[PDB]
Chain length 260, copies 4
């Protein structure tokens, strides 16, 4: 009857919601901190530095150590460093991702790069896509930062990183190695930093396809909170139920545990 010993937690839709608060999300982090329970904040977003995420969270009454924040950009860089294929890349994405990759020592090579890395680019163009296509055809290791097919905006549900990757997969017949949730690489790396065994951890989030499938596919218990992307109405028809479903994180006691 041991309680969970560590937490992996989504941000947008869970701890805050766009520009709006989720006060129970703020209290969830507050309570983790008061109890001394380790956690990681795990996001597919590739546009912010961890410093920027940390500062943004202060506006929602969350003061979290820098080292608790783990983004798909960090995991992408970490994977590139591990695979050790060479310090050249061609990148499609926002400045945050491009700067992280360049800061890690990867220099732009538009023709024979070791890596082609593709995240959301709000200003993607045919020519960027053609450049990536040829580079992939020429043998670069093709990485997608995150598989999300859409990104919610004030305009509506626009194409996400996963849709841009879909164009290149169609054009090259090469499937990208996707780093972000629900895939293994970001989960393994976040678990490593958490330094708690997988069977003592819980993944907490609002998004069934990224957060909850992250737990199902990687064998980690799951807490779905219905404050974000996955609506209350959608829960009954989920093919695989999460370990827990909550309307508010205030319902969580921290006494919950695996097989407990």
């Amino acid at each position: 009857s041991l309680a969970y010993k560590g937490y992996l937690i989504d941000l947008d839709g869970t701890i805050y919601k766009g520009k709006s608060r989720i006060p129970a999300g703020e209290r969830f982090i507050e309570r983790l901190q008061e109890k001394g329970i380790p956690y990681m904040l795990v996001t597919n977003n590739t546009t912010r530095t961890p410093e920027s995420v940390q500062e943004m969270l202060r506006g929602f009454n969350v003061e979290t150590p820098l080292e608790t924040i783990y983004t798909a950009t960090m995991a992408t860089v970490d994977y590139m460093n591990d695979m050790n294929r060479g310090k050249t890349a061609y990148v499609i994405g926002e400045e945050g991702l491009k700067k992280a990759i360049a800061d890690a020592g990867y220099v732009e090579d538009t023709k024979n790069p070791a890596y082609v890395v593709v995240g959301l680019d709000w200003n993607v163009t045919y020519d960027k896509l053609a450049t990536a296509t040829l580079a992939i055809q020429n043998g670069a290791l093709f990485i997608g930062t995150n598989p999300d097919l859409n990104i919610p905006t004030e305009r509506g549900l626009l194409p996400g990183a996963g849709s841009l990757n879909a164009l290149l997969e169609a054009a090259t017949r090469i499937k990208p190695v996707f780093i972000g949730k629900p895939n293994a690489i970001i989960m393994n790396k976040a678990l490593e930093i958490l330094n708690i065994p997988r069977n003592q951890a819980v993944m907490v989030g609002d998004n069934y396809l990224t957060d909850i499938m992250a737990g199902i596919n990687n064998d980690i218990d799951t807490l779905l909170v219905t404050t974000g992307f996955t609506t209350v109405e959608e829960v009954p028809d989920l093919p695989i139920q999460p370990s827990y479903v909550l309307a508010s994180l205030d319902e969580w006691t921290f006494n919950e545990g695996h097989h407990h």
Copy 2:
């Protein structure tokens, strides 16, 4: 032992090859004309008017009546007119396609168009893709002009119309109605203009996935000539052999026929 009574024929790779001649292709049309055998020239290209195709072919010693030329742009417009969903559209593509659609009376509606039509756009942008995504989500009838995943260029095999459509299918979960070869709509419409029964026609081309599958999927005999996209080396491993495989159209006698 009746010879084929009509021909459906690809252009680039078959009658000419980019800026270069295929002299036996020119002689194939010459011989059709001398024998009085009806034919259509059927292309997935969406960037030229039939007038432009006709003029271009003169440079390769081919003088063909305007009415022999049938492009994926024409078939797209014809399909839109038939389906009669309304005279509004949002189009991704080159000027040739956009002008044809506007000339047909479709006015641009970026929000609630009856149709979203997607062909190759050498200058596609995130914002054009986002606009199409929302319009499709809002209920527009989503049409792809042609399914080709790539387009050959001097640079290499770049993303084609089919790859741009792939991004939108990923972002919307809606599969486009593809008009161009090897799909039925362009084939039915070309056959209609040809005015010869399907079982008395042959589809002639260089490209297995567009021309030869056009015949296999639509039940029309096929002549593969290995002067273009599908190489001589690839022929043995084709999953379904064409009705005929030729190294040069000069080998064709016009005495060939169905079950003959």
Copy 3:
């Protein structure tokens, strides 16, 4: 303002429903007959001879000439005869399909058949699937009779012909040529027998994915009647609306027409 000149019409779910009547379906055929309007009854079912369909329909007060009935089995045989690849086949399916193929002169070849043909087999086995896999790998022309993923039964929605084909596509990497609705081959052949131009015909049925997509994908107007597979509640969320949606075929006047 010309009325439609010919009809293509689904059976189960439209003219009758399993063992139960749809009286307005019976009256639809009665009215067609009284008005002298040509029609075809077009079904993906591969288990009955057209004689058997004709006799069964008598129990639902429908007396229809034998030549009005066109099944996926007939269209499969017709396609095999047209493609003229040789009088050998390996077949997965029920006795009705196997007998039709043998009656057409195709002899069983388990190793090097010209054709592999796959429909629903209520008693499919690993060994039949392995036999078909090897035969396809060896170069046989792989045909699926109909693409339906499921078949409704008293037990529930069981795997259909399309699901059996899916196993073989996975095992061989070869996609079958699917004959049945909504694909072109059965539609072209039914239209040929109907002998009415495509733009003067309407496809009538209860099943969006087979009957209504048959019209959308092949450019034929569509009448969805909500007495069968596609429910009234599902209509608003259809990606492409049918030309007409009716709760009962009694609402149809026969004065309806294309662009009319």
Copy 4:
């Protein structure tokens, strides 16, 4: 310049080949043992107990502790125990898999089982497939033991577990959680038993799509030995090269390491 500290190693195609020896594979294990380097033998096969694998390996001059053997059956049971959805299952597979699941306390429930588990069944039938389909539709957690599309036999490349899963995915629209290589679950669990950090481990095998993609997708260095499924000729066209490619395991020194 630290050498790898642990090994994950495929069996058939790597340590032996069907009924035939790979003597350098036997010497690879001998050398690991002499050097005291920990290893796991990781296989997608679901038909043998680890005792049976251990006995079989003795015939190839390999004496390995029982605890070094980790199969897709073990990992499937482990995952079912972890997910803790209930002690009922419906299983498609061979007796080895069925016995392991029953030994773990899962009782057969053909209607409302907590789990549906699908591996290769040499005698699969329509009725077993229909039973699984309904059980999945009814909400069971659908698990595929291993994703391999084919299984090599004396007859040829027959349908594998992944192809049987493909039928059920088509019939249900539910994708299985695949346990076996190259998926994360079997890799994480083997790594756990190995008790060596991921970045100090190497995955060794003959099969690009299962063993080498296991390393690429899960961020573990890879040794491809060309004695089995992936041929020497196929190596140049691999989309992502392994960390090492060897013609014989005799070329490996055990001085090789990560970034070393």
